[PDB]
Amino acid sequence: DVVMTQSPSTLSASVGDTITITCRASQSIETWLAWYQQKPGKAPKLLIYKASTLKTGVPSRFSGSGSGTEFTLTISGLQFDDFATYHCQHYAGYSATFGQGTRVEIKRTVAAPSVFIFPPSDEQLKSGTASVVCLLNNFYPREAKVQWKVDNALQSGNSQESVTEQDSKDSTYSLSSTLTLSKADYEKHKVYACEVTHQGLSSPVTKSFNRGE
Amino acid sequence: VVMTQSPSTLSASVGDTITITCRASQSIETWLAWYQQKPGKAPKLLIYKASTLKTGVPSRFSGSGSGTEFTLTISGLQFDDFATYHCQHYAGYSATFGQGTRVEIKRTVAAPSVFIFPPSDEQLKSGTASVVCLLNNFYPREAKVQWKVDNALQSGNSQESVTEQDSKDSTYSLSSTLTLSKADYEKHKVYACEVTHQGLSSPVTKSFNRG
Amino acid sequence: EVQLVESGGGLVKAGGSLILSCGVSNFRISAHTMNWVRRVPGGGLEWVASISTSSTYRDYADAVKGRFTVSRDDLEDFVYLQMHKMRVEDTAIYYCARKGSDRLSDNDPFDAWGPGTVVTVSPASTKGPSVFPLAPSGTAALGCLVKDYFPEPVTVSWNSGALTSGVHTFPAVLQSSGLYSLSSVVTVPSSSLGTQTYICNVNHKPSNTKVDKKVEPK
Amino acid sequence: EVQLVESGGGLVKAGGSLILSCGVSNFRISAHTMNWVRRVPGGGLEWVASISTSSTYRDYADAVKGRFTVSRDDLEDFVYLQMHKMRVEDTAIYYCARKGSDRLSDNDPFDAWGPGTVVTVSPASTKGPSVFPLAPSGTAALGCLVKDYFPEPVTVSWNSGALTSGVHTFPAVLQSSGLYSLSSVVTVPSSSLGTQTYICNVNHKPSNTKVDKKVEPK
Numbered sequence: 001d002v003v004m005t006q007s008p009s010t011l012s013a014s015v016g017d018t019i020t021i022t023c024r025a026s027q028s029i030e031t032w033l034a035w036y037q038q039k040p041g042k043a044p045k046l047l048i049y050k051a052s053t054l055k056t057g058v059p060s061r062f063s064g065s066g067s068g069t070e071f072t073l074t075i076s077g078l079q080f081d082d083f084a085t086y087h088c089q090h091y092a093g094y095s096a097t098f099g100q101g102t103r104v105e106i107k108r109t110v111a112a113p114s115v116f117i118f119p120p121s122d123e124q125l126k127s128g129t130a131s132v133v134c135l136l137n138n139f140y141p142r143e144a145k146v147q148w149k150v151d152n153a154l155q156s157g158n159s160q161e162s163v164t165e166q167d168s169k170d171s172t173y174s175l176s177s178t179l180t181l182s183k184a185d186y187e188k189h190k191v192y193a194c195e196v197t198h199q200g201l202s203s204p205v206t207k208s209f210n211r212g213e
Numbered sequence: 214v215v216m217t218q219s220p221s222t223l224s225a226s227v228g229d230t231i232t233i234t235c236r237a238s239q240s241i242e243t244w245l246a247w248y249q250q251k252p253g254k255a256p257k258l259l260i261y262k263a264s265t266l267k268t269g270v271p272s273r274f275s276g277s278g279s280g281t282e283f284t285l286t287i288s289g290l291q292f293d294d295f296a297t298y299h300c301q302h303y304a305g306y307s308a309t310f311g312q313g314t315r316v317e318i319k320r321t322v323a324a325p326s327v328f329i330f331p332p333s334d335e336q337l338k339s340g341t342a343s344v345v346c347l348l349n350n351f352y353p354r355e356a357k358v359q360w361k362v363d364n365a366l367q368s369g370n371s372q373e374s375v376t377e378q379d380s381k382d383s384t385y386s387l388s389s390t391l392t393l394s395k396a397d398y399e400k401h402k403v404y405a406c407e408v409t410h411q412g413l414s415s416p417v418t419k420s421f422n423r424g
Numbered sequence: 425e426v427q428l429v430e431s432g433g434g435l436v437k438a439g440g441s442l443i444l445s446c447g448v449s450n451f452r453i454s455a456h457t458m459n460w461v462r463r464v465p466g467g468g469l470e471w472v473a474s475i476s477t478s479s480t481y482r483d484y485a486d487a488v489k490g491r492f493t494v495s496r497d498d499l500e501d502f503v504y505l506q507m508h509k510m511r512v513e514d515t516a517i518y519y520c521a522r523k524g525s526d527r528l529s530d531n532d533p534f535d536a537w538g539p540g541t542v543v544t545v546s547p548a549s550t551k552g553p554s555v556f557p558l559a560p561s562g563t564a565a566l567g568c569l570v571k572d573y574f575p576e577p578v579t580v581s582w583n584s585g586a587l588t589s590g591v592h593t594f595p596a597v598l599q600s601s602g603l604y605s606l607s608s609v610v611t612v613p614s615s616s617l618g619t620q621t622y623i624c625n626v627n628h629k630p631s632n633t634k635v636d637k638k639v640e641p642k
Numbered sequence: 643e644v645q646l647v648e649s650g651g652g653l654v655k656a657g658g659s660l661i662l663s664c665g666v667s668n669f670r671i672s673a674h675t676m677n678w679v680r681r682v683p684g685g686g687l688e689w690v691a692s693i694s695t696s697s698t699y700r701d702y703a704d705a706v707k708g709r710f711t712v713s714r715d716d717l718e719d720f721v722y723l724q725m726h727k728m729r730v731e732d733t734a735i736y737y738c739a740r741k742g743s744d745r746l747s748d749n750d751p752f753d754a755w756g757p758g759t760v761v762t763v764s765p766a767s768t769k770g771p772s773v774f775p776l777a778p779s780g781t782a783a784l785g786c787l788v789k790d791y792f793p794e795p796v797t798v799s800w801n802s803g804a805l806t807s808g809v810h811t812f813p814a815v816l817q818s819s820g821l822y823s824l825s826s827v828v829t830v831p832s833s834s835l836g837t838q839t840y841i842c843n844v845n846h847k848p849s850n851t852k853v854d855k856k857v858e859p860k
Binding site for chain 3 (some may be wrong): 114116118121123124127129131133135137160162163164174176178180
Binding site for chain 1 (some may be wrong): 675677681685686687688689692693699701737739743748749750751752753755756757758810
């Protein structure tokens with residue numbers, strides 16, 4: 001069975017750049033590819049309903065190609081509208097499969113995260129819950145790793161991360177991580193720290209605080 | 214179509230012959246059925262076409278009536294027969310039900326013994342306070358519990374649960390739990406439970422002072 | 425025995441949506457009119473939906489008419505009941521019932537019933553947030569913290585729109601409570617922490633619960 | 643323009659079960675093969691299931707094949723997806739999209755999609771109880787308060803089954819947290835409170851949790 005080898009997994013560019021992407025089928029199909037855009041948390045939008053075959057109502061900047069095994073998508077000078085994911089699809093009669101989508105994004109130089117750690121407010125803590133927040137305020141590119149340590153003990157399974165998409169004035173990513181603990185468990189330990197690694201950092205960055213200090 | 218059923222509660226002794234009546238607001242011919250329902254269980258069919266006993270239903274169950282008046286007779290109540298019962302009008306592509314009747318074992322009136330329990334220190338240290346009021350061994354089943362905190366009538370912050378009839382003494386027991394965060398419980402001192410019941414000539418209150 | 429098993433019960437919120445289903449064994453459903461029934465808080469039954477053989481007719485009680493939708497899929501032996509715009513009086517056990525007999529006829533009782541599944545409609549249709557300061561420790565970061573609300577959004581601004589440079593409000597996270605949390609932050613010159621009074625003007629727009637919080641050094 | 647409207651998605655537990663559905667507007671599904679797609683937290687689209695025109699052929703992606711069932715209703719225009727015994731990686735946004743074109747063919751792409759509905763499969767399949775003492779303040783009453791356990795049931799004995807007279811173990815109640823709680827009590831002679839030891843044996847087979855709690859005066 002077919003698997004799609006879409007490349008790259010992320011494309012970096014800017015307004016007015018002409019860009020090309022490529023989906024390569026693991027075994028040959030009869031030019032049964034189509035291409036979609038997807039904006040974050042939205043439904044995908046169909047661009048190209050057969051390889052090189054643009055759907056009506058789609059902006060004329062779009063294009064593509066197909067050879068029965070190797071395929072392309074191309075955009076003829078990106079708009080600020082175009083900085084979304086793009087997915088290839090192979091569609092058979094009663095099944096389909098998609099590429100791991102090419103994320104199109106606004107380019108800049110590498111920038112390391114400014115890291116900040118916030119203890120729980122006393123007002124939260126008296127209710128019985130402690131939410132410790134770690135903020136990576138601005139960085140580029142998107143890929144970063146945050147780990148929590150409580151009394152130098154690497155934590156696992158008690159945190160939730162979300163990343164804001166590219167900032168409108170500098171195109172950096174930002175991450176925040178929330179470590180959640182009942183008031184009981186939080187008052188059991190002293191230091192609460194978050195440790196960060198990223199493309200711009202030569203060594204991990206750790207921010208910490210001592211409970212009550 | 215609308216239906217009425219009577220009595221809403223029927224109290225009887227083992228071995229009795231009892232009748233439960235259903236009245237239709239307009240003629241439904243013999244298009245009525247009867248159902249037995251145990252607590253926590255889906256209803257089981259007893260009779261249909263007014264009198265037609267379902268295959269395997271014991272002969273002690275019978276039904277009669279046509280037009281607007283229908284009766285379900287149980288001739289010799291066995292312990293299994295003390296249950297909920299419901300008359301049910303049925304038509305080609307629809308139905309409707311009456312309010313039901315509850316059949317219970319009859320005994321003398323017994324007033325509840327009332328007890329109130331404050332939250333345990335352990336739970337209270339976790340941030341939640343669950344007081345529990347207990348109404349023990351009362352009959353009949355209807356009882357009313359009202360919680361008052363500093364003479365303030367509570368509403369919407371309590372849940373109740375009631376046992377089935379005790380197999381030895383045929384009474385009911387009831388537990389009511391008033392739940393409050395530690396933040397809301399420490400605000401008010403006295404916590405009371407006002408009980409009314411057919412066995413009480415005036416309401417009974419059990420209370421405690423926080424701390 | 426005839427086998428029926430309901431699925432898809434549990435907790436829901438007023439104005440919310442759910443879908444029940446029932447599957448079966450030891451019979452094929454196609455010869456039967458199929459029903460949904462519920463047990464309302466008084467221990468009494470109500471009928472809720474009926475779908476005929478071949479999906480010809482669908483009938484509902486007035487309480488659920490236009491809100492709900494029954495469906496069936498005989499080729500895998502399943503019956504479904506959509507429950508859009510649930511209300512607190514829909515709190516009940518629900519059951520999938522077969523219309524039937526030892527010999528099927530043009531009009532019959534309900535013979536085989538599944539063990540049922542519970543549905544609870546909690547009145548928390550717009551649960552208002554809890555809102556808390558994130559206090560500043562050349563550049564300083566401060567913020568506000570929202571917990572325990574439904575549905576989305578909770579909206580935030582700094583000093584009623586007087587502050588916008590360096591502002592970030594994060595995507596919400598779904599907690600194990602089934603309620604949302606988020607945070608809003610801004611970075612400012614450290615020298616201004618003494619003179620400028622930072623505040624966050626917030627709203628849970630579903631409940632229209634308008635909140636404010638001053639954020640200042642601890 | 644045309645529309646699709648997914649419903650039923652929310653919080654779930656691992657090895658628990660849920661049913662999604664999709665309605666439509668401005669069009670009839672009776673002409674179309676109807677498809678389920680998801681976007682996992684990893685950001686990629688996965689196909690999930692499809693069901694043909696005329697309900698003839700049902701197909702699945704191999705991660706959900708056998709576990710899920712797709713269903714349809716060509717008359718009221720609804721599609722369904724039963725999700726029996728979900729996995730943690732079944733957590734996704736779940737979209738309902740129609741296979742389609744201006745002129746239809748034996749093979750087309752997905753030309754209209756609904757806004758999608760979130761499903762979260764939390765990893766806690768069973769939760770073991772906490773047990774707390776109900777301390778005895780003639781005849782006295784004491785007990786144990788089993789709490790925060792999922793799913794049912796919990797069994798309770800007293801003194802390893804030697805104390806049965808006077809014991810009431812109550813039906814569990816389902817809390818607004820989605821977790822169960824029950825209390826087991828016993829009445830005993832007040833004179834025995836100094837000498838006799840009272841232990842409630844709480845067993846929760848679904849979590850393989852056993853707790854023996856000694857109940858004594860404060």
